[PDB]
A paper describes a structure:
Type II DNA topoisomerases are essential enzymes that catalyze topological rearrangement of double-stranded DNA (dsDNA) to maintain chromosomes in an appropriate state. In particular, DNA gyrase introduces negative supercoils into covalently closed dsDNA molecules using the free energy generated by ATP hydrolysis. The GyrB subunit is comprised of three domains: the N-terminal ATPase domain (GHKL family), the transducer domain, and the C-terminal TOPRIM domain. Here we report the structures of bacterial GyrB43 in complex with (i) the pre-hydrolysis analog ADP⋅BeF3, (ii) the post-hydrolysis ADP⋅Pi and (iii) the product ADP.
In addition, the structures of GyrB43 in complex with ADP⋅BeF3 (2.4 Å) and in complex with ADP (2.0 Å) were solved. Finally, the structure of the GyrB43⋅ADP complex is globally and locally almost identical to that of GyrB43⋅AMPPNP. The only difference is the presence of a water molecule in the approximate position of the absent γ-phosphate. As expected from the unchanged domain organization, the Q335 side-chain interacts with residue 26 in the same way as in the AMPPNP complex structure. No domain reorientation is observed for the binary GyrB43⋅ADP complex. Table 3 shows that upon superposition of the ATPase domain the transducer domain is still well aligned (rmsd of Cα positions: 0.8 Å). Concerning the GyrB43⋅ADP complex, the structure was obtained in a crystal form unrelated to that of GyrB43⋅AMPPNP. Still the two structures are virtually identical (see preceding section) ruling out any crystal packing artifacts. The canonical, restrained structure is attained both in presence of AMPPNP and ADP, as for topoVI-B'. This indicates that the γ-phosphate is not required to restrain the conformation of the enzyme.
Numbering used by the authors:
A (entry chain A), B (entry chain A): 5 to 302, 316 to 386
The structure:
Amino acid sequence: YDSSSIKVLKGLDAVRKRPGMYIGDTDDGTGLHHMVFEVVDNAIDEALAGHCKEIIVTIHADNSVSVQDDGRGIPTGIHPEEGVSAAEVIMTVLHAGGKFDDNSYKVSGGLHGVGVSVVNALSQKLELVIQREGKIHRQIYEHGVPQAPLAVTGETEKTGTMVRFWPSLETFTNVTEFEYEILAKRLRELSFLNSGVSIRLRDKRDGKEDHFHYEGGIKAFVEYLNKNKTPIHPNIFYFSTEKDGIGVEVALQWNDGFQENIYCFTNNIPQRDGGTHLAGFRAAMTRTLNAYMDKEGYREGLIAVVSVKVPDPKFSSQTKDKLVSSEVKSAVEQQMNELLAEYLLENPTDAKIVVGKIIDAARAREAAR
Amino acid sequence: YDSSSIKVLKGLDAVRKRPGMYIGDTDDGTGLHHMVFEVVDNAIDEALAGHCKEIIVTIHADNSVSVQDDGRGIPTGIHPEEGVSAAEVIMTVLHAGGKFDDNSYKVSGGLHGVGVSVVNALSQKLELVIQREGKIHRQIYEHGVPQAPLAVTGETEKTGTMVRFWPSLETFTNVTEFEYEILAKRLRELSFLNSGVSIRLRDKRDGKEDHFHYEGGIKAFVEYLNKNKTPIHPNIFYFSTEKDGIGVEVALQWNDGFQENIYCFTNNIPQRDGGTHLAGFRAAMTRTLNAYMDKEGYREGLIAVVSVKVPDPKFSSQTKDKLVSSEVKSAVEQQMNELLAEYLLENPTDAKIVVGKIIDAARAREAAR
Ligand SMILES: Nc1ncnc2c1ncn2[C@@H]1O[C@H](COP(=O)(O)OP(=O)(O)O)[C@@H](O)[C@H]1O
Ligand SMILES: Nc1ncnc2c1ncn2[C@@H]1O[C@H](COP(=O)(O)OP(=O)(O)O)[C@@H](O)[C@H]1O
Ligand SMILES: [Mg+2]
Ligand SMILES: [Mg+2]
């Protein structure tokens, strides 16, 4: 034990040595599919910026997945400081990208500079095809190692990025094939969240195919989620605001069931473990309903979607399961307080049905004890 | 948007730009204290290896924390490939350390090669003092930047490492002072887990002080945890095995309360979010009790500690909240099946009390519905 015991891992080698701090669980399917999501998220960030209007996700018969976007294309020109194409830099260097300021993407779900480079690292093979600057470029990688320099292989009028990857089985175990339904659920949700972006999903294994292009936003997303439940009130509460540089968008409606289903998103990335947006939502829900009950003389069945747009959010893991930016709590909480109280005044009937379900649950416990 | 839009973050700059993927939540106190834990974990890994027998954690009156160990000392000699002292490499290079193989630490809670380097990155100041090779060495950093080369400042017979850091307030917000009790709880738990390592905690603010040197292992840890609850049975179930290169150690006892408190650890690091060790524990608990009930003609109040030793575990975030190595499920599950069934045969009285509480809960629901 001395100075020769200390090893430095360079390039993408650290990712292959310790995948879980980057990609999550490489044994239950979730990190495998998160590989796709990292790539799709980059396309989505072109769409947010206004440049991409179609996304095509294909599950190939050889268990690879491609994501095609019609955005601006990953930059192709030689990187001054690094001396190789900017595209190769992106694919091979951790904490390298165009989202560390707000000049290329005002708001974006990427922010770590590691996503596609992590997909590369954990792919036995990867294929990159970029249309920009009137040219088609293309490069191949194996286990993150470029096989040759980014190369012009044609002319075109189109711009866009195509990434196809075959995941390494020396990394992913147990669940090793892509599941249509997991990719579908995510891409469907993304369509509600990105009105006007055409998002296609194709399974070359059995020829199954979906085209998601929903137009009603998260309000329609809530209708969809209650399709085969029974909503107890007709008016879905909805608002979209931006104040103090934070966008807050909320839709919700109660059904006659007994589960709570709250979807939280930050710049289109889902938070399984919630966070400061969720905590603001709950605080405003509590405060607003209790003021409505005080004034009128007085969880279960709730479906809600909470989507925020934030210039530099903070997540407590690479995979972004929990948003931990505390100023986002205050933002959702005050926007919601204000607009939810207006909703209850403007729809007295909905208000009463909802408050009645709430009280029925309280009485039910009380009748038990 | 072109190749000049693509920025590379070098050294420790990425950590300062996106702290949460490394340190967790920098707004609620948890990441602040995790700074201490990263440093303490490195000491603990010397203890696991058999080299460190005392650890002194001091909260200083200027809100800095020092951790002193009597282990081998961070290597001081110039690193061949990197050309600076191995110690400076450790402090300044991500994914750099002595735990990527098993030559320096057979088992260890570190594994990413990033912990202390992350503490450095997020410290407005850091002080390193290393006793090895008959010399005292010392180096200072500010915001992760070394102020001068590692330097010999004396002779000594001792070996050990001292790290003192002052956390940056441009990173940590809301909770910015160290809380005695948070450090105490963790260090206490560590003492149960590392019998024979003297672990001291000193608060130079008010002169409060603790010395943790518990000898009964996780069995004693369970007694402690039930101190001020009421255990319903006298015999704490306990075992420590190592098979197939995985160590599994479990203690548990039921009290007459109604909460479940299961502490999981991997190579001494706690998993707030559980994982494959927890899932193995639960599977074996279910199977073993149901076989005991079948044979005898037939969560609440449980306290349990599950500690595993694994050569290369996999966590799904830098902060290690969830162990995601699936072979650890099978290991805990079979060791526990085997030894828990023996415990129930060997202590028929305990067995009956425990199974009676379990059934009482089932009946209570049933009497409700
Ligand atoms: N589909 C894409 N279209 C255009 N540019 C992209 C695309 N994917 C990646 N990039 C560029 O490569 C950069 C690095 O991507 P990534 O490594 O995934 O990190 P991040 O998205 O967190 O920056 C992005 O910031 C962006 O500038
Ligand atoms: N207290 C210590 N005593 C001896 N060596 C240490 C100590 N702390 C750190 N090191 C060495 O520095 C290396 C890098 O530490 P760190 O960056 O925290 O990553 P990791 O613990 O995951 O390797 C460790 O692997 C170890 O070799
Ligand atoms: Mg990305
Ligand atoms: Mg460490």
